């Protein structure tokens, strides 16, 4: 009886907090059309350090 | 005889809090539910909830969820409207409903308009209201009286002391500034006006003021 209802024991809530997102991340997907590969390809002859 | 039988209309401010007395009689007042019908001042009924008669449990429609206080007296089979933090759509004729239950509500309380609004009263300001050339109508010459600001309602405007309801259509007093004009048309043949007064009879008993204010030609 002290809160709010004349009878005692038992009760009803809903309880609603708006959601919102603080941080939120992505995975994403590759095509493998998109995909490249770059190869460096190469032969020794005379060469320098450089 | 039962009959649902309410506190009077009580005039209110914002932030107070008013209850709303039902008091139920001519039924064993336990066997019913007891409701409430929110009728705005102009819009239709809007019903508040009820409590249970026998429990004393309220329940309240969403919109009147939290605002309100549905608390009954079981003994003397009163029923309460209880509006706590009065705001102006608190203004509103409100009905205690008793419960048919899913056939509905049977009858009601004689109806409590609380009226929630800040102003102090104030007396009208009342004009005898003189016609000109495109004033008259035929024999009939109109005449007027412009009461304005006064707050609250109402004001009794009667015509020579209400010998004059004849041509009279008293129009329903408005709300400006929170304070009140209603303008009364008396239809006074041309032949009575101003040969005979035709005078303007403003009583306002909450600013206690009886203006009378005769119209005489500009």
């Known amino acids: 009886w002290g809160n709010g209802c004349g009878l005692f024991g038992k009760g009803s809530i809903d309880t609603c907090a708006k959601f919102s997102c603080t941080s939120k991340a992505i995975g994403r997907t590759i095509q493998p059309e998109n995909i490249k590969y770059e190869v460096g390809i190469f032969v020794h002859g005379t060469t320098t350090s450089e | 005889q039962v009959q649902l039988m309410e506190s009077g209309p009580e005039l209110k401010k914002p932030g107070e809090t008013v209850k709303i007395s039902c008091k139920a009689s001519?039924?064993?007042?336990?066997?019913?539910?007891m409701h409430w019908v929110k009728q705005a001042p102009g819009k239709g009924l809007k019903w508040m909830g009820w409590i249970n008669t026998g429990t004393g449990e309220p329940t309240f429609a969403a919109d009147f969820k939290g605002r309100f206080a549905f608390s009954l007296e079981t003994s003397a089979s009163t029923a309460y409207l209880q509006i706590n933090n009065l705001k102006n759509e608190d203004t509103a004729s409100y009905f205690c409903?008793?419960?048919?239950?899913?056939?509905?509500?049977?009858?009601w309380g004689q109806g409590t308009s609380v009226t929630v609004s800040s102003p102090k009263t104030t007396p009208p300001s009342v004009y005898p209201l003189a016609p000109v050339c495109g004033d008259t109508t035929g024999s009939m010459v109109t005449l007027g009286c412009l009461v304005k600001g006064y707050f609250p309602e109402p004001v009794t405007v009667t015509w020579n002391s209400g010998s004059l309801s004849s041509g009279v259509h008293t129009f329903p007093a408005v709300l400006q500034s929170d304070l009140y004009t209603l303008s009364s048309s008396v239809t006074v043949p041309s032949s009575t006006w101003p040969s005979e007064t035709v005078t303007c009879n403003v009583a306002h008993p909450a600013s206690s003021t009886k203006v009378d204010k005769k119209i005489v030609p500009r």
């Open positions: 409903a008793r419960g048919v239950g899913l056939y509905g509500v049977d009858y």
């Open positions: 001519g039924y064993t007042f336990t066997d019913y539910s």
